[PDB]
Amino acid sequence: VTLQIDDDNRVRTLTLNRPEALNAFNEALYDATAQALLDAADDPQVAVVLLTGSGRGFSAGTDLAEMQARITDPNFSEGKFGFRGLIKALAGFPKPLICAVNGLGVGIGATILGYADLAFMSSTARLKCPFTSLPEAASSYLLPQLVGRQNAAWLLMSSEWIDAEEALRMGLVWRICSPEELLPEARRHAEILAAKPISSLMAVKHTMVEP
Amino acid sequence: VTLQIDDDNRVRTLTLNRPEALNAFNEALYDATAQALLDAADDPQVAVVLLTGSGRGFSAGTDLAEMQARITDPNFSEGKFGFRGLIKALAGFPKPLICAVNGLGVGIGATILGYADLAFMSSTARLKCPFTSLPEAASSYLLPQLVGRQNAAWLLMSSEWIDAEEALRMGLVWRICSPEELLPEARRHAEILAAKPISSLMAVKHTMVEP
Amino acid sequence: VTLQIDDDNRVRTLTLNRPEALNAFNEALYDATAQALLDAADDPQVAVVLLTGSGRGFSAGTDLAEMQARITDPNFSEGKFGFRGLIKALAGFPKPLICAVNGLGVGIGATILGYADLAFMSSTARLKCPFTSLPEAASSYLLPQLVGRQNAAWLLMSSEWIDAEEALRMGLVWRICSPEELLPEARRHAEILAAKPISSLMAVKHTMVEP
Numbered sequence: 001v002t003l004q005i006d007d008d009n010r011v012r013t014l015t016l017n018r019p020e021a022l023n024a025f026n027e028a029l030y031d032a033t034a035q036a037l038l039d040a041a042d043d044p045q046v047a048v049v050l051l052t053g054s055g056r057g058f059s060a061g062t063d064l065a066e067m068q069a070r071i072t073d074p075n076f077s078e079g080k081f082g083f084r085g086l087i088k089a090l091a092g093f094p095k096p097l098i099c100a101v102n103g104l105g106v107g108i109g110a111t112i113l114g115y116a117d118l119a120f121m122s123s124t125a126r127l128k129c130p131f132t133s134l135p136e137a138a139s140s141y142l143l144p145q146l147v148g149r150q151n152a153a154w155l156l157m158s159s160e161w162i163d164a165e166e167a168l169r170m171g172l173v174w175r176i177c178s179p180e181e182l183l184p185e186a187r188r189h190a191e192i193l194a195a196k197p198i199s200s201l202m203a204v205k206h207t208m209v210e211p
Numbered sequence: 212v213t214l215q216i217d218d219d220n221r222v223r224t225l226t227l228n229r230p231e232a233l234n235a236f237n238e239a240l241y242d243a244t245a246q247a248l249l250d251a252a253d254d255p256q257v258a259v260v261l262l263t264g265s266g267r268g269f270s271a272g273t274d275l276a277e278m279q280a281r282i283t284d285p286n287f288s289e290g291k292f293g294f295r296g297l298i299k300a301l302a303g304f305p306k307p308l309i310c311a312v313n314g315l316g317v318g319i320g321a322t323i324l325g326y327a328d329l330a331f332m333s334s335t336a337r338l339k340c341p342f343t344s345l346p347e348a349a350s351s352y353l354l355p356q357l358v359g360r361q362n363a364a365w366l367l368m369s370s371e372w373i374d375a376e377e378a379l380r381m382g383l384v385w386r387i388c389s390p391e392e393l394l395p396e397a398r399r400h401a402e403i404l405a406a407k408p409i410s411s412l413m414a415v416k417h418t419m420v421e422p
Numbered sequence: 423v424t425l426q427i428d429d430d431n432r433v434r435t436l437t438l439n440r441p442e443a444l445n446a447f448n449e450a451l452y453d454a455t456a457q458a459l460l461d462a463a464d465d466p467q468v469a470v471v472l473l474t475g476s477g478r479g480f481s482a483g484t485d486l487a488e489m490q491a492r493i494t495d496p497n498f499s500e501g502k503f504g505f506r507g508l509i510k511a512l513a514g515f516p517k518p519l520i521c522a523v524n525g526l527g528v529g530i531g532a533t534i535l536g537y538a539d540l541a542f543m544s545s546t547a548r549l550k551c552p553f554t555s556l557p558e559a560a561s562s563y564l565l566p567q568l569v570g571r572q573n574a575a576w577l578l579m580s581s582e583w584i585d586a587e588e589a590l591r592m593g594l595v596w597r598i599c600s601p602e603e604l605l606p607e608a609r610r611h612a613e614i615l616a617a618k619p620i621s622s623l624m625a626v627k628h629t630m631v632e633p
Contacts, residue, residue: 096368117364131626132618140629146359148568149630150596153539157518157626158614174361192369196343204342204368207351208360307579328575357570385572403580407554415553415579418562419571 003032004054010047010194011187012040019055022104024063025086027070027079034081037089047194047201049093050186051112052100058125061107083108090115091138094202096193100186101125101173110155110162111135114142117205119173120186126161127172133159147171214243215265221258221405222398223251230266233315235274236297238281238290245292248300258405258412260304261397262323263311269336272318294319301326302349305413307404311397312336312384321366321373322346325353328416330384331397337372338383344370358382425454426476432469432616433609434462441477444526446485447508449492449501456503459511469616469623471515472608473534474522480547483529505530512537513560516624518615522608523547523595532577532584533557536564539627541595542608548583549594555581569593 004015014036016023025033040046053059062083070077081089090097090112099113101121110127113119129135135156144152151170155162167173177185193201215226225247227234236244251257264270273294281288292300301308301323310324312332321338324330340346346367355363362381366373378384388396404412426437436458438445447455462468475481484505492499503511512519512534521535523543532549535541551557557578566574573592577584589595599607615623 096364116361117368118361132615132622135626135629137629140626141633142360144630146361148593149564150538150540150568150593152630153518153627154596154611156630157539157618157623158611159618160614171359171361174365189365189369192371193343196368196370200343201368204346204351205364207346207348208355208363208367211352307575327572328579329572353571357572382570382572385576400576400580403582404554407579407581411554412579415557415562416575418557418559419566419574419578422563 002026002029003036005036007046008187009191010045011050011190012043012046012048013050013052016051016053016059019053019057021063022057022060023053023055023109024060024065025083025108026063026066027077027082029063030083030086031079031081034085034089037093041092041094044198046095047196047198048096048098048190050098050100050190052183052186053102055103057103057109058099058101058105059109059112060104061109061130087136087138094205095198096190096201096205098186098190100182101127102179102182104128106130111139111143113172114139114146118186118189120175120177120182120189121164121167121173122179122182123164123176124179126163127155127167128159128161129156130159132157143172213237213240214247216247218257219398220402221256222261222401223254223257223259224261224263227262227264227270230264230268232274233268233271234264234266234320235271235276236294236319237274237277238288238293240274241294241297242290242292245296245300248304252303252305255409257306258407258409259307259309259401261309261311261401263394263397264313266314268314268320269310269312269316270320270323271315272320272341298347298349305416306409307401307412307416309397309401311393312338313390313393315339317341322350322354324383325350325357329397329400331386331388331393331400332375332378332384333390333393334375334387335390337374338366338378339370339372340367341370343368354383424448424451425458427458429468430609431613432467433472433612434465434468434470435472435474438473438475438481441475441479443485444479444482445475445477445531446482446487447505447530448485448488449499449504451485452505452508453501453503456507456511459515463514463516466620468517469618469620470518470520470612472520472522472612474605474608475524477525479525479531480521480523480527481531481534482526483531483552509558509560516627517620518612518623518627520608520612522604523549524601524604526550528552533561533565535594536561536568540608540611542597542599542604542611543586543589543595544601544604545586545598546601548585549577549589550581550583551578552581554579565594
């Protein structure tokens with residue numbers, strides 16, 4: 001399975017589970033993640049979603065090796081959702097979304113933070129938006145609004161790694177945690193939110209995300 | 212009197228004065244505060260308003276005990292302004308507004324900071340938005356714009372206390388002061404602003420608040 | 423010459439060069455700077471512009487002494503661009519713009535930072551917006567968006583000096599540097615950006631500046 005899903009005290013944890021590929025999103029992982037979010041959106045026993053990665057990476061982003069195979073096959077193939085479908089699930093997700101960035105986040109592995117209501121980042125993790133060394137409309141409205149024009153310029157134009165202290169200093173993530181405290185801290189905050197009525201969490205989220 | 216009003220060097224200080232009720236806004240205090248702001252807006256001898264609380268609280272927010280009495284009385288009763296009228300006075304106030312948060316700020320006692328041009332907070336004060344354990348459209352546009360999506364999510368969804376260092380780290384307040392330095396620092400900054408021509412203070416405020 | 427222009431590794435450095443007048447913009451310097459930006463915008467060998475000042479000042483802002491002479495001459499005279507033309511060149515500049523604030527920045531010498539994609543500031547530099555002791559629509563949308571309502575209120579209403587640590591704390595500048603490290607650090611970051619394809623730098627900038 002490319003995506004592990006587990007419930008605990010009304011927090012649904014999605015753990016990206018292609019650790020050998022640094023949790024790069026192939027089509028199957030894009031599809032699984034997007035579907036997991038729609039399901040979470042609809043499930044009355046889920047208050048909060050927590051997203052994290054298995055192993056040393058958070059997500060290396062789009063799986064470019066699979067993408068090469070797909071464009072060179074006799075017949076092109078796609079997932080039901082793909083990148084485009086994940087962005088729409090993320091953009092419309094009506095419940096609190098918490099990211100626990102456990103290691104490298106590249107491309108969508110970094111820009112996904114624009115849809116997070118809270119982001120915790122391991123002190124050993126780093127982020128990169130590699131667009132200029134190689135983005136979506138949503139990311140480039142959301143990120144500048146979060147970190148300001150200057151921080152966003154460096155993040156999105158440089159293709160340089162951004163470390164945990166820089167990400168926090170930017171306001172790109174909310175808290176830095178030691179590697180071993182990341183999930184305990186993220187989960188503790190998720191459980192505070194998840195104890196609240198789901199209806200009122202959704203109403204607050206909607207009032208702050210509408211513009 | 213529920214609201215003390217005093218002028219000194221063209222700064223009008225409004226001191227919420229129900230210290231036994233932690234300066235909870237009953238209808239009479241909502242009315243007095245809203246009226247005090249319209250008057251300040253119109254008074255040519257007032258450049259700046261400084262808002263603070265008497266005693267250990269800044270404001271415990273809407274007086275829920277009075278609200279219970281009102282909804283259980285034979286006849287319902289209201290103030291000329293109430294909550295709704297205070298928000299409109301705050302939203303339209305055309306002069307610099309400085310808040311000196313001297314202690315607990317709950318509900319509107321916290322979200323009122325979205326209308327502040329500067330906010331100073333005592334190092335022993337804490338803030339709470341209790342909506343989810345129990346908001347207005349304005350607060351949830353203004354606050355996210357001030358503190359960013361992630362800080363706003365925690366503030367508005369958690370119903371947890373936010374201490375002085377957290378409020379500053381968020382950008383929810385501008386400066387932290389020791390308890391004894393709060394009013395002297397707030398007043399010193401208010402007097403710098405108040406020495407300027409009122410016309411030009413209003414023009415600058417209007418140019419930065421229009422969108 | 424009032425403006426020195428030099429190319430090095432696809433970074434074009436504009437060095438304001440009226441050091442005796444603390445790099446105040448007379449009409450000739452407004453015209454030279456605006457023109458230098460249009461040219462840079464069009465030049466395919468320029469990826470990034472770096473703007474800094476010669477001598478102890480970054481820019482003292484509009485040259486008020488020249489302005490007095492102009493309004494008291496028999497015949498009024500103007501530059502092809504002036505203040506108005508510089509703002510339009512700045513607002514439309516489609517490539518990364520980096521400011522290296524080497525000393526005092528007053529009026530437009532401070533508000534020009536609202537158009538910077540990155541701003542580095544010497545630890546001995548200070549900024550001032552003197553409007554109230556004496557602004558444009560763009561500055562007062564851009565600056566509040568960058569530093570938040572409270573920081574913007576102090577910056578734009580107080581007419582007080584803002585030092586390097588305050589400017590950084592506000593988010594008005596991205597990094598503080600020792601005086602001797604300012605240009606080396608600004609240039610190092612400019613060269614990271616400038617190594618990228620110009621087309622993709624412009625596309626990223628446009629996606630983050632459109633709203």
